[PDB]
Amino acid sequence: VTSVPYKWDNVVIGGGGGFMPGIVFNETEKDLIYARAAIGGAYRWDPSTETWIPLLDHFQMDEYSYYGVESIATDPVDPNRVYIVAGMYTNDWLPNMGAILRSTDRGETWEKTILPFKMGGNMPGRSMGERLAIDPNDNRILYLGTRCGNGLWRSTDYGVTWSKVESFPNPGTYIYDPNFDYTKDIIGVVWVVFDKSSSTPGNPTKTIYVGVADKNESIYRSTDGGVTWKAVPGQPKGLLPHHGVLASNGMLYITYGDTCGPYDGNGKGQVWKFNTRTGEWIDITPIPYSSSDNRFCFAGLAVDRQNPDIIMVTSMNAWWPDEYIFRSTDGGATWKNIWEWGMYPERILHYEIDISAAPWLDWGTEKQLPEINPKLGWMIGDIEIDPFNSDRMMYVTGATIYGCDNLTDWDRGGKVKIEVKATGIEECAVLDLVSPPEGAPLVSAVGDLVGFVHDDLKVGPKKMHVPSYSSGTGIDYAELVPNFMALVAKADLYDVKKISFSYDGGRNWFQPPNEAPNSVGGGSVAVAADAKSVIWTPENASPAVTTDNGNSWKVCTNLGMGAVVASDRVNGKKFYAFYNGKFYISTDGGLTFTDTKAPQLPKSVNKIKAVPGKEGHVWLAAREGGLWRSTDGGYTFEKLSNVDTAHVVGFGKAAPGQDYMAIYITGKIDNVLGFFRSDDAGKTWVRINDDEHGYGAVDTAITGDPRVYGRVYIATNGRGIVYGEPAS
Numbered sequence: 133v134t135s136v137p138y139k140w141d142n143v144v145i146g147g148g149g150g151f152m153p154g155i156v157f158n159e160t161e162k163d164l165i166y167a168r169a170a171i172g173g174a175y176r177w178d179p180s181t182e183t184w185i186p187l188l189d190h191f192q193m194d195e196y197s198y199y200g201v202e203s204i205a206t207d208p209v210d211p212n213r214v215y216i217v218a219g220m221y222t223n224d225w226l227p228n229m230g231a232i233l234r235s236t237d238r239g240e241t242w243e244k245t246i247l248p249f250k251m252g253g254n255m256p257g258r259s260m261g262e263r264l265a266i267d268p269n270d271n272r273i274l275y276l277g278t279r280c281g282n283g284l285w286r287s288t289d290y291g292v293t294w295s296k297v298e299s300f301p302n303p304g305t306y307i308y309d310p311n312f313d314y315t316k317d318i319i320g321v322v323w324v325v326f327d328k329s330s331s332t333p334g335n336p337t338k339t340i341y342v343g344v345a346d347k348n349e350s351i352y353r354s355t356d357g358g359v360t361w362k363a364v365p366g367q368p369k370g371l372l373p374h375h376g377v378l379a380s381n382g383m384l385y386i387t388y389g390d391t392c393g394p395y396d397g398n399g400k401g402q403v404w405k406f407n408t409r410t411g412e413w414i415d416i417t418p419i420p421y422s423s424s425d426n427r428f429c430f431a432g433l434a435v436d437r438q439n440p441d442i443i444m445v446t447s448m449n450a451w452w453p454d455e456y457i458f459r460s461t462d463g464g465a466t467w468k469n470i471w472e473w474g475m476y477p478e479r480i481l482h483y484e485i486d487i488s489a490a491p492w493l494d495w496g497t498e499k500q501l502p503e504i505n506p507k508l509g510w511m512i513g514d515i516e517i518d519p520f521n522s523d524r525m526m527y528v529t530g531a532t533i534y535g536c537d538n539l540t541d542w543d544r545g546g547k548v549k550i551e552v553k554a555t556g557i558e559e560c561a562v563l564d565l566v567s568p569p570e571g572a573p574l575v576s577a578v579g580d581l582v583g584f585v586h587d588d589l590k591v592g593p594k595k596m597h598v599p600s601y602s603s604g605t606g607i608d609y610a611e612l613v614p615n616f617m618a619l620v621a622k623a624d625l626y627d628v629k630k631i632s633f634s635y636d637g638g639r640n641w642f643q644p645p646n647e648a649p650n651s652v653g654g655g656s657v658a659v660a661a662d663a664k665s666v667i668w669t670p671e672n673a674s675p676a677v678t679t680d681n682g683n684s685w686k687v688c689t690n691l692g693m694g695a696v697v698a699s700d701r702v703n704g705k706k707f708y709a710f711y712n713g714k715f716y717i718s719t720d721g722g723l724t725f726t727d728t729k730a731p732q733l734p735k736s737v738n739k740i741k742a743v744p745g746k747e748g749h750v751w752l753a754a755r756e757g758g759l760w761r762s763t764d765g766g767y768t769f770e771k772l773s774n775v776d777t778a779h780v781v782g783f784g785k786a787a788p789g790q791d792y793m794a795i796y797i798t799g800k801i802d803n804v805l806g807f808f809r810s811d812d813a814g815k816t817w818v819r820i821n822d823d824e825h826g827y828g829a830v831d832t833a834i835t836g837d838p839r840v841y842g843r844v845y846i847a848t849n850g851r852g853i854v855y856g857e858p859a860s
């Protein structure tokens with residue numbers, strides 16, 4: 133397999149779209165900022181454009197786990213150096229061991245060392261940090277807090293080799309929830325803070341503080357450069373230290389919560405300052421811990437480098453009416469929240485939010501007071517004050533990064549001007565994609581933000597499909613009536629019918645009175661070529677068909693849970709299904725299915741898809757089982773001998789001189805992982821991505837563009853929607 137040069141970019145959703153658990157400023161170089169994602173890699177700030185640049189896109193599908201960024205550390209001695217602790221899950225959801233990634237240039241290129249344990253970039257408590265830290269006097273030294281009881285680890289050769297600090301007393305005892313696989317692991321050692329003043333440049337820093345997720349004993353200190361460790365006397369129990377920050381006046385500020393987050397509510401929190409000079413602990417909690425108004429973790433912690441009495445903390449989570457952002461200018465003696473209660477409804481805001489860079493952030497919804505869209509946020513596990521600009525703040529939310537450039541205006545009775553600061557970040561998990569033959573070039577179904585019509589690939593959409601939904605999980609259009617679409621969804625927050633129909637190419641949506649039998653909605657959807665029927669296969673539910681736009685539903689005969697269903701693109705009566713190792717055809721619009729008795733089939737399939745303009749042409753994407761085609765409606769299939777792995781399959785405009793739509797897949801050909809195109813109906817393939825453009829997990833959706841030769845749209849799991857075109 134040979135390669136052809138392509139240009140790759142994101143289709144713009146705008147504003148990130150997911151949870152970035154941390155932002156890290158460099159301590160010595162102005163405008164040097166990094167941001168870490170739960171499932172979407174890491175970014176470096178570009179001050180010339182005020183946009184973020186993705187750093188880890190070289191990771192191919194076999195290293196998807198390394199888009200899970202547990203911690204990021206930026207070198208204060210040599211700002212060219214940056215390190216990442218990478219690995220998405222501590223369970224068996226992905227097979228990779230964790231790794232420390234190292235760069236000298238500054239995230240442009242990487243090397244890695246694989247560790248003997250896993251990281252948890254997308255685990256509970258992921259906004260607690262930073263777990264990875266560089267010694268500010270001797271930058272050869274790095275420390276790493278780990279999950280799962282592996283304790284504290286250390287490198288003394290610029291992150292190349294790693295060993296356990298055996299003298300560290302406590303790897304952590306707190307576990308989010310032992311009753312489930314996802315939540316059962318020890319949260320562990322959560323942050324490392326060096327006291328720079330304890331040594332002189334060139335020498336290993338002697339005094340080191342370590343936070344541990346342990347309600348009985350959480351704060352540790354070494355005074356001999358990490359040889360021995362002791363709990364700090366007088367420390368509070370029994371909450372969990374999210375963040376610690378050592379200010380220039382010797383005060384170690386620490387935020388505490390009763391859970392690790394990020395989703396928890398009701399809710400206890402504390403904020404403390406430890407005087408590292410005197411050994412005194414002082415409770416500076418904005419809302420007294422004893423008060424029932426104290427109803428959330430304190431999580432985010434920022435300290436102004438230019439004034440150690442200036443500090444900010446955030447709630448995680450009030451959830452209602454909005455979050456709290458508290459500011460103190462007297463070292464926590466007194467605090468002010470960024471909003472106050474007035475005459476209920478009714479709230480007094482010390483801020484404005486400008487969402488012009490990501491207008492979907494208001495959810496297209498005017499709220500009933502005291503609620504207001506767009507919100508300050510939620511899941512605000514990290515807040516930063518620029519160490520070189522007291523007027524600049526940034527904080528994270530479950531959907532974006534917000535920030536301001538006039539922070540100290542608050543101190544003089546003006547409003548903080550908050551705006552989206554996540555331009556260039558695209559972290560959505562995309563579940564389905566269609567590129568219809570008329571209308572917009574792309575219509576998406578995405579996790580958390582539902583999905584969008586994409587009129588212009590380079591301009592972010594203004595609103596999501598259906599604001600009452602939580603995730604769009606499947607979308608299809610009627611091939612011969614391409615203005616007609618169906619969207620299926622999850623709706624965690626509202627009792628709304630979880631399929632919607634559009635008559636205007638996905639711009640406006642309505643819900644029917646009834647659903648296919650389902651527990652949580654979701655699943656997939658297939659629309660008849662002529663729009664006369666729709667098959668919804670909801671999550672953990674049997675395929676069901678409607679011939680009256682969801683007024684009534686009937687279970688499709690002979691199918692069942694897990695069936696993979698697609699419609700023919702020419703004949704509205706024909707639908708196809710792969711179910712329990714067998715292939716099925718319907719010739720009555722989805723009402724009944726019959727086993728075609730195909731003599732050769734893969735054991736299982738991820739996706740099946742019919743070809744526009746070719747009745748009875750059906751392709752099977754069987755992952756490591758390969759790529760298969762039928763041209764007789766699925767009575768016989770041929771396995772293509774020139775494709776190893778095909779996770780997904782899609783179609784775009786035919787190449788000149790060719791008699792078939794161009795075919796696009798992700799997977800593996802001749803021990804090369806990536807994305808591939810065939811212009812000659814699968815006879816020959818070319819690699820269209822390259823080593824620098826992997827984008828991780830690409831096994832949910834792919835489509836060509838029926839109107840633009842060479843263009844391909846690919847759903848990623850944490851890098852949004854990517855699209856490629858041949859280089860010019």
Ligand SMILES: OC[C@H]1O[C@@H](O[C@H]2[C@@H](OC[C@H]3O[C@@H](O[C@H]4[C@H](O)[C@@H](O)[C@H](O[C@H]5[C@H](O)[C@@H](O)[C@H](O)O[C@@H]5CO)O[C@@H]4CO[C@H]4OC[C@@H](O)[C@H](O)[C@H]4O[C@@H]4O[C@H](CO)[C@H](O)[C@H](O)[C@H]4O)[C@H](O)[C@@H](O)[C@@H]3O[C@@H]3O[C@H](CO[C@H]4OC[C@@H](O)[C@H](O)[C@H]4O)[C@@H](O)[C@H](O)[C@H]3O)OC[C@@H](O)[C@@H]2O)[C@H](O)[C@@H](O)[C@H]1O
Pocket residue numbers: 149150151152170171196224225226254255312313314530560561579580829830831849850
């Ligand atoms: O999920 C559907 C489908 O996944 C198929 O596998 C994929 C997948 O493999 C990895 C793993 O993915 C988990 O889902 C991830 C998802 O991929 C991410 O996009 C999403 O990221 C969030 C992120 O957390 C936020 O921070 C950010 O802002 O937004 C993004 C985008 O929305 O995270 C989820 C995981 O969610 C959980 O963890 C993060 C928390 O934020 C979140 O709240 C939490 O959600 C809860 O999870 C619990 C689990 O107890 C529970 O489901 C709650 O309902 C939910 O709210 C999949 O969950 C996981 O299944 C995938 O690993 C595969 O697991 C198979 C076993 O699955 C069963 O058991 C777990 C259960 O969750 C499943 O529902 C159930 O089916 C196992 O056989 C297989 O070996 C594992 O690989 O992504 C990579 C891709 O290549 C894979 O194809 C999978 O094939 C299919 O079976 C199905 O699970």
Ligand SMILES: OC[C@H]1O[C@@H](O[C@H]2[C@@H](OC[C@H]3O[C@@H](O[C@H]4[C@H](O)[C@@H](O)[C@H](O)O[C@@H]4CO)[C@H](O)[C@@H](O)[C@@H]3O[C@@H]3O[C@H](CO[C@H]4OC[C@@H](O)[C@H](O)[C@H]4O)[C@@H](O[C@@H]4O[C@H](CO[C@H]5OC[C@@H](O)[C@H](O)[C@H]5O)[C@@H](O)[C@H](O)[C@H]4O)[C@H](O)[C@H]3O)OC[C@@H](O)[C@@H]2O)[C@H](O)[C@@H](O)[C@H]1O
Pocket residue numbers: 150151395396397398450451452495507510529530531580599602624625
């Ligand atoms: O989660 C639904 C569940 O909530 C149970 O209640 C518990 C739960 O509450 C969270 C919700 O609180 C609401 O406020 C409540 C308040 O908690 C009450 O104290 C008060 O009395 O009433 C208030 C008003 O009802 C908030 O309004 C909700 O927004 C919040 O739900 C979370 O919503 C966010 C997304 O919000 C945005 O998008 C939707 C839009 O409507 C909203 O305006 C926007 O702000 C989700 O965050 C995203 O989560 C995904 C991951 O999601 C997966 O994992 C977590 C699971 O919760 C999801 O179901 C699953 O799909 C992540 O990738 C994104 O990055 C995030 O942005 C949260 O997932 C929603 O939970 O939790 C706190 C606890 O104290 C409450 O008791 C309730 O019992 C259930 O009936 C059910 O509604």
Ligand SMILES: [Ca+2]
Pocket residue numbers: 154155156514515516
């Ligand atoms: Ca931070």
